[PDB]
């Protein structure tokens, strides 16, 4: 159960980062990170897939209700690979990922605010920031985490967000999933060299997941070892 | 600048279509729009033209377009937000597949599971050209009137 919660994020992920690490500002604010970079990045055979990530909170006008909300330019595999359940609708095709449709995913709570009526979501349009957006899918949270006190959150194909309501080449991050059952330790340094190449400087700054995965795996199985062993010893004593 | 003036006998709209779609949008194509504040009160008219000079909001260039809506009763304040529907073509007598259940092998080939009269779902490869914001105009490989398991489809799966 707990591993399924953990492996729910698969194998693996190398989110791309600027600056130095998590706490950095200006060097992290600047991003020499073309989404085009992914091309050659996706070119490596061991990789199964790798995906762009970006997000922007913006004001959202609508009919009468008129409030800002966070939003998330992402892959269509997002709710898929996260396995996030849908309140309604689906994610989106890669074709329409290229289609730049004004399709979009929203919080159920966001609907709770927008829609006292509980009107059907699909086919409806609501502007984000400025651009009109024909809402379709909305997804229920797959975690409780009530202490998070989650606010309004929204999801877009990244091509649309970063594209036709941002236009920057530099997305917040890029997920990178390896194939082959390949080890987390290896190649991440090779990708590091890769960023030492396609960029001229030490700018990978990425975090990684079979490291923490394998170690918590050894941890849990170790707990199995202690528990089952002392149990069986006691029973043999019986 | 002592004082500004404006003629409100008719209202012009600045419909900022994205640069990706500007290549289409032939003049005189019929279009309609509606304001956020009145929810449902459609206005409509001919498109007039396209402005030669773009202006941008950081990322992504946008090109304007204009109408010429009549303004009875003194409604529509200046710079009011207005959602705008511009019309592309209406080819007819042809099926379009909802995108919710599409299968797309190769990214060219396109399998699609559909329920049969037997209660057996079965997929078929199909070719499709035209694509829509919501669906895709299928051209071959599926009959009209066919049941189509839009939700949680799998091939060969009798229900």
């Amino acid at each position: 159960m707990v591993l399924a919660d953990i492996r729910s994020i698969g194998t693996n992920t190398i989110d791309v980062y600027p600056g130095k690490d998590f706490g950095d500002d200006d060097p992290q604010y600047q991003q020499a990170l073309k989404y085009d970079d992914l091309i050659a990045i996706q070119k490596q055979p061991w990789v199964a897939s790798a995906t762009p990530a970006v997000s922007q909170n913006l004001r959202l006008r609508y009919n009468n209700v008129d409030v800002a909300a966070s939003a998330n330019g992402v892959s269509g595999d997002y709710f898929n690979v996260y396995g996030m359940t849908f309140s309604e609708g689906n994610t989106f095709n890669q074709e329409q990922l290229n289609g730049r449709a004004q399709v979009v995913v929203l919080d159920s709570n966001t609907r709770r605010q927008l829609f006292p009526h509980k009107a059907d979501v699909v086919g409806e349009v609501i502007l984000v920031g400025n651009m009109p957006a024909r809402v379709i899918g909305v997804a229920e949270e797959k975690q409780s985490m009530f202490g998070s006190s989650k606010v309004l959150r929204v999801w877009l194909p990244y091509s649309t967000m970063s594209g036709r309501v941002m236009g920057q080449s530099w997305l917040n991050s890029i997920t990178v999933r390896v194939k082959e059952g390949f080890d987390s330790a290896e190649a991440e340094q090779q990708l590091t060299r890769l960023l030492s190449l396609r960029h001229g400087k030490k700018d990978f700054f990425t975090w990684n997941m079979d490291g923490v995965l394998k170690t918590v795996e050894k941890t849990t199985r170790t707990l199995q070892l202690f528990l089952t062993l002392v149990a069986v010893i006691s029973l043999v004593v019986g | 600048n002592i004082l500004t003036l404006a003629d409100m006998s008719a209202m012009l709209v600045k419909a900022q279509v994205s640069e990706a779609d500007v290549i289409h949008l032939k003049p005189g194509q019929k279009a309609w729009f509606t304001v956020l504040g009145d929810q449902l009160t459609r206005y409509e008219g001919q498109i007039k033209d396209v402005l030669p000079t773009p202006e941008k909001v950081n990322d992504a260039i946008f090109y304007y377009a204009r109408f010429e809506v009549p303004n009875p009763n003194g409604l529509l304040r200046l710079d009011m937000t207005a959602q705008v529907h511009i019309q592309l073509t209406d080819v007819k007598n042809v099926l379009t597949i909802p995108l919710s259940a599409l299968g797309d092998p190769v990214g060219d080939n396109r399998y699609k599971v559909k329920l049969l009269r037997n209660g057996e779902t079965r997929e078929r490869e199909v070719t499709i050209g035209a694509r829509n914001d919501t669906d895709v105009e299928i051209v071959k490989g599926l009959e009209a009137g066919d049941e189509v398991v839009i939700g949680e489809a799998k091939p060969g799966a009798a229900q």
Binding site: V125, R134 | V17, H85, V94, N132, A144, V148, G151, Q159
Partner: peptide, 22 residues
């Protein structure tokens, strides 16, 4: 486990491609 499937009746439809814009 119910094999229940959401489904639709396809018909010779007419194209409604036009898009939108703020």
């Amino acid at each position: 486990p119910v094999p229940t499937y959401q489904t639709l009746i396809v018909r010779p439809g007419d194209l409604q491609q036009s898009v939108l814009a703020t």
